[PDB]
Design a protein around this ligand. Structure first.
Ligand code: HEC
Ligand code: HEC
Lengths: 126, 126
């Protein structure tokens, strides 16, 4: 869907921006600094679920640029493992949110955040 | 969820970027220049549905900036009418996509695009 590689870069960066907001806005809730409303969090994690499927198709052939490392493309199976594992982490977060289970939410949130960081550390330029 | 107004601006702009991609990538399909796969379009319109609910909460009190006009905030009921009418247009598009009805899709796509433009013309700086 991208006329030029620059359009794929713009897309995936914007998807990252929105994920960061929908993930990070739950930090105070996980920490107990903000109240836990199970329905609010369930709805927010749904949004995050949708968003977290979006970046990967915007690292398609010819879309090199931004702060994306070349290794994304030369090691396609390995990058794919990391995005699929991340989306698995999001499923765990969704399950926790859908159940209304705050302890589960805390734990799953930590594992999601670790997965974001592990991919950035390997595949995003500093 | 925004630490500073600039964070709300960044969010709503990124939501616009992603909507433009998920809306605009259907133009060739509507025009018949690309094939119509009902399941593909149904899934894409779902994504667009989720995205098209996101900008409005990022025009919250104190979030003035970017290319957003002041009138957004001073005329709150009227801006709200335009975003609610837009989301109604998206419901029509979803219904068309879910039914697999290309003629309905064409018509609903045109009305969505008109609604994007009408809001930008009134509320986005040039
Ligand atoms: C690899 C499998 C990733 C996972 C998992 C996550 N991110 Fe990511 N992210 C990735 C890359 C390769 C890039 C660079 C894209 C480019 O072309 O520049 C990014 C970028 C971001 C950004 C910055 C966007 C920008 O302003 O330029 C953000 C804010 C971001 N990513 C957030 C984010 C979050 C919160 C994630 C987990 C919920 C996450 N990413 C996972 C690769 C990968
Ligand atoms: C008002 C009810 C709007 C409707 C309906 C749509 N958009 Fe919008 N959009 C609106 C404003 C006020 C702004 C400016 C935000 C700012 O603070 O700068 C925007 C911006 C965009 C952008 C540009 C994002 C950027 O790169 O800075 C895009 C690409 C965009 N909008 C797309 C878009 C599409 C495709 C829409 C219909 C599907 C749509 N918008 C509707 C206000 C409103």
């Amino acid at each position: 869907q991208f006329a030029k590689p620059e359009d794929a870069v713009k897309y995936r960066q914007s998807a990252g921006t929105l994920m960061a907001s929908h993930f990070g806005r739950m930090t105070p809730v996980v920490k107990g600094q903000a109240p836990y409303d199970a329905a609010q969090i369930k709805a927010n994690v749904e949004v995050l679920k949708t968003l977290s499927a979006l970046p990967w198709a915007a690292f398609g052939p010819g879309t090199e640029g931004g702060d994306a490392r070349p290794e994304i493309w030369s090691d396609a199976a390995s990058f794919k493992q990391k995005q699929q594992a991340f989306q698995d982490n999001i499923v765990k977060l969704s399950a926790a949110a859908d159940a209304g289970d705050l302890d589960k939410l805390r734990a799953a949130f930590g594992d999601v955040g670790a997965s974001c960081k592990a991919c950035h550390d390997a595949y995003r330029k500093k």
